Design a protein around this ligand. Structure first.
Ligand SMILES: CCn1cc(-c2ccnc(Nc3ccc(N4CCNCC4)cc3)n2)c(-c2cccnc2)n1
Length: 295
């Protein structure tokens, strides 16, 4: 009596995350994520968050329902959300280039969702950090704004209790996007601010991925993932620690940015998301204000 009301129409992805299907519910398109059997803790955390918190914002993936169902005679865990036909930012950036307006609309919309997650509202949601932000977890909507998905690693904090709720999930972040303090295990795990600073690091990487695809002086970079030149596909913990902690590498700023105002303003933001000192990074709210101002 939720799963039963839904028809899986097509599988639009299969990976370590499980599967994502386009489905119909009352004849309306929905996305259905089917969690891998190894990943009940991500389903549990996401269902806990979207059910217990008023988590609703233009730039956060819109929750509809969570259910358990039997298929091929075993338990499947479903998360059911709005369907975005364009798919992920990761796929979008491969199939197309951006003008100034569409590059800024994308990165401002991501900053707006991230600032909404990071801020505690009273009277209402706790502060939330994401902990696995990446271009593959961000969906592009038909208005050309984005929405953030995949809250299964999220951490919450309430000023009322000054309680940090870190959950019970053995899953770790996407290795490519892990901040230095995560890779070297120096992150201060009892301070909520540590988790928000991990998201700013990842946001910087996504800003880099997007800016590369904005046309300036008639030219543009091909899509590349962060650190494409120094680590393999599916990089290991050790691959990433060598690069980010030991060599202290950062993605290169291309040369053709430096005489463009928009891209100089974006390159400034990304460097201030990437300080090795977490405390020195900008906040999501500071990022959102600055992008509101850029032309
Ligand atoms: C694996 C990333 N992901 C995408 C979606 C998601 C959420 C909502 N809508 C869509 N739509 C979508 C449309 C087209 C594609 N394709 C584009 C062409 N290239 C192949 C993929 C992919 C996804 N995807 C979700 C998701 C779903 C439910 C709950 N939580 C997360 N995860």
């Amino acid at each position: 009596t939720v799963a039963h009301q839904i028809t899986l129409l097509e599988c639009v992805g299969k990976g370590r995350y499980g599967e994502v299907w386009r489905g119909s519910w009352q004849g309306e398109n929905v996305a259905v994520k089917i969690f891998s059997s190894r990943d009940e803790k991500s389903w549990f955390r996401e269902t806990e968050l979207y059910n217990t918190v008023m988590l609703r914002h233009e730039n956060i993936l819109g929750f509809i329902a969570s259910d358990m169902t039997s298929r091929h005679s075993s338990t499947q865990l479903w998360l059911i959300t709005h369907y975005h036909e364009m798919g992920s930012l990761y796929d979008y950036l491969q199939l197309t280039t951006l003008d100034t307006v569409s590059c800024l609309r994308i990165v401002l919309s991501i900053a707006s969702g991230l600032a909404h997650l990071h801020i505690e509202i009273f009277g209402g949601k706790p502060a939330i950090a994401h902990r696995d932000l990446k271009s593959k977890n961000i969906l592009v909507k038909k208005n050309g704004q984005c929405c953030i998905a995949d809250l299964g690693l999220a951490v919450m904090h309430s000023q009322s209790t000054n309680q940090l709720d870190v959950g019970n999930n053995p899953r770790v972040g996407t290795k490519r996007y892990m901040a230095p303090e995560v890779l070297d295990e120096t992150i201060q795990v009892d301070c909520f601010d540590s988790y928000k600073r991990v998201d700013i690091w990842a946001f910087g990487l996504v800003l880099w991925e997007v800016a590369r695809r904005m046309v300036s002086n008639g030219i543009v970079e091909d899509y590349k993932p962060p650190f494409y030149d120094v680590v393999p596909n599916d990089p290991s913990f050790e691959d990433m620690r060598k690069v980010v902690c030991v060599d202290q590498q950062r993605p290169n700023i291309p040369n053709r940015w430096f005489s463009d105002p928009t891209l100089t303003s974006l390159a400034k933001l990304m460097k201030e998301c990437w300080y090795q000192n977490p405390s020195a990074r900008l906040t999501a709210l500071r990022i959102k204000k600055t992008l509101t101002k850029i032309d």
